[model samples]
Target: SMEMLTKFESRSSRAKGVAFHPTQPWILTSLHNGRIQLWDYRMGTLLDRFDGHDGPVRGIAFHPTQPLFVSGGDDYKVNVWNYKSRKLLFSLCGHMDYVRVCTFHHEYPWILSCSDDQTIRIWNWQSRNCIAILTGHSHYVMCAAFHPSEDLIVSASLDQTVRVWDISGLRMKNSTDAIVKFVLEGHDRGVNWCAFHPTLPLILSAGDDRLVKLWRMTASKAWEVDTCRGHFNNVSCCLFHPHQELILSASEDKTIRVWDLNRRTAVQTFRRDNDRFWFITVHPKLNLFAAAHDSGVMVFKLE
Candidate 1:
């Protein structure tokens, strides 16, 4: 039900990361050639090239309320920048391997990051300290995101697992780390990405198995709810459109597909050549969504 409205061509390498500004008509895309481009969506123009990270910048996150944004990369470090001032505030150092994803908390003074080091670390931006380290994945942690609520973390990993760790009891106690609350297993291959439902007890995961699995929690445990199938190759990323009635998934098959929740079927499939999609994101306020590929980023809307 979604169709491409327009796209921006990146003259560099692969576009692996995409993030939307919460209240602005802007988007940031990180490229594998060690570049991050901020764009004005309404004008279809590049605002500026924000820089700090070295090598490939695989992570770029815009804060929901502030002028701050954080990015991490193959350089194994996290850099926070003030886009309004076009300044690099500081760099966060802790991960021993390449950082894959760095993001802000929904309602806290923290930055949540996961890395090839196989751990997820939370940095308190206000205090400038690494507040919590969540360790569980035996392989590289691919993606980590704070729940829409507080203190709950959902991460997917190359260990063929999806984890939901509850740190609700640790932060206030001034703790440093904690064990996992739930281990969700279903993917037959490495899980690539994971996301929480905008307003439900739901988790959506895409993986090397070319499948998108949905999970939910009960009174005591979390379990796989169902699997959405369509992609012919490994699924690189998936996101919840609790803003809509469908789930969106991108794959190495060079396509982004939309699966209807009620019908459990793919109602739409978009495909192109010469570029494999590696990341996907949705805007918080606008009826907009975008996906990253080897060639560029495509922004679109649902029918």
Candidate 2:
């Protein structure tokens, strides 16, 4: 069901995160050794290497329309860069521990990040200021991002809960605090990742419990829809298919599993004999999917 399109091998360090440029054939791989490499996937060439973070770089993202990108790492810093200029723009510092994920908002100049410090933050990238500090997770916040078309934020935590926060007040330009709208607590173990559906009232989360969960939400409440069970080890990342009725998950079990969204049944599985997968991401406007693993990164497409 899937075909390998390209592969980039790294002998020194594991790739912790991977992201595709919004409109380019480039892919960015964040490494465990505090470096990020930009590769032209189609041509199979290394375009650039960014080295500024002090330790492992776990989070990486590309800006939707600018010649810029953002990354967070074990250094507890969020560094915004000008990929075109090959220069570091600035660093946002506040987290007291390692930063797990960093992402950009689609229509706003906002950056969303979660950290081991047990908090999620929303930063106004234009103003270079942290506009909101969302605190409630009792343990490390592993992943968080803004809803594609809503004034909401979803986060996963080691406390075994996923939180949906209402940031409509902040979007309306007055409030500096986001109120928790729902605390989803169905995962039996700490959640590792959580993502919102591209255009639906749905959420996906996976973690140490080794299950990927689907959740449905309405104006007043949210509930678990179903769980996809297959991976025997910790699930590191899971996401919705951008334009299809499918779900994708990567796990420490050294495999990537695909599930039918309607039935929540395992449709296919791809395994690596020696490398455990850490992250997986889809190209914004392509059929391509890139996954980070212990030894390298691979780009593939589903048939």
Candidate 3:
């Protein structure tokens, strides 16, 4: 059901995270060597590289409409950079442990980051201040992301729980705190990633347990809807299809599995012989998918 478009090979180190430029044919890839490389995926050319963070740069995300991108690393630092200027703007330093992922809010000037410090923090990049610190997970918070349309957030942790936090209060003039709205407990092992559906009340999570779970939420509660199982190793990342009834997951099993959202059955799978996948992300406005693996990254699309 999918065809390979092109791929970029990174021989220096394993790729940890990847993001597609909002309106450009370029992509950003963060590597274990602490360098972020910008590539014109359309022409198979390396455009540029930015270096500032220390140790492995595990998370990277591009601003929806800005020339900026944010990255988090084992140095416990979050850095914001302007791609046009090709210089580091500033670094947010509050995390006590390795920062796992950093992402920009689609409409707000906010950056959300999760860390091994067992906390998720939201920062106002414009003011260079930590606006809110969500503390509840007992283990490393592996990933966190803002809701596509609501004042809500979803975070996955090694605590074997996926937490939903409400940030509506933070949007108010005086409130700077977010309360845990839902504690979704189902994954038998530590969760590695969790994501919100672009336009639905559904959440997708995959983990060391090797299962991808779908959860449905209402105003008062959220419960497990179904579990898609087949990955033979830890599932590093799983995300909803931006405009289709499908879920795509990458795992250490060296495979990217696509599942039918409605039937919860495996529809198609793409595999590599030597690379174990670390992350996978879909284009915000296109049908393309980019996945990070041990040796590099691959870009593909459904045929």
TM, every model: 0.95, 0.97, 0.97
lDDT tens string, model 3, 146-201? 99988999999999999999999887743346999999999989999999999999
16: Cα error in model 1, Å? 1.0
Q: Is candidate 1 or candidate 3 better by TM-score?
A: 3
Clashing pairs in 1: none
Q: Could you tell me the lDDT of residue 35 within candidate 1?
A: 82
Candidate 2 per-residue C-alpha lDDT over 1-303 given as tens digits, one digit per residue, 9 for 90 to 100: 654545544454799999999888898899998999999877888899999999999999999998889999999999999998999999998999999999999888999999999999889899999999999899999999889888899999999999999999888883445899999989989999998888889999999999999999998999999999989999999999989999999999999999999999988899999999999999888878989999978888887
List candidate 2 segments past 4 Å from native. Answer: 1-12, 174-176
The per-model lDDT (C-alpha) reads 0.86, 0.92, 0.92
Q: Which 10 successive residues of model 2 have the least lDDT summed? A: 3-12
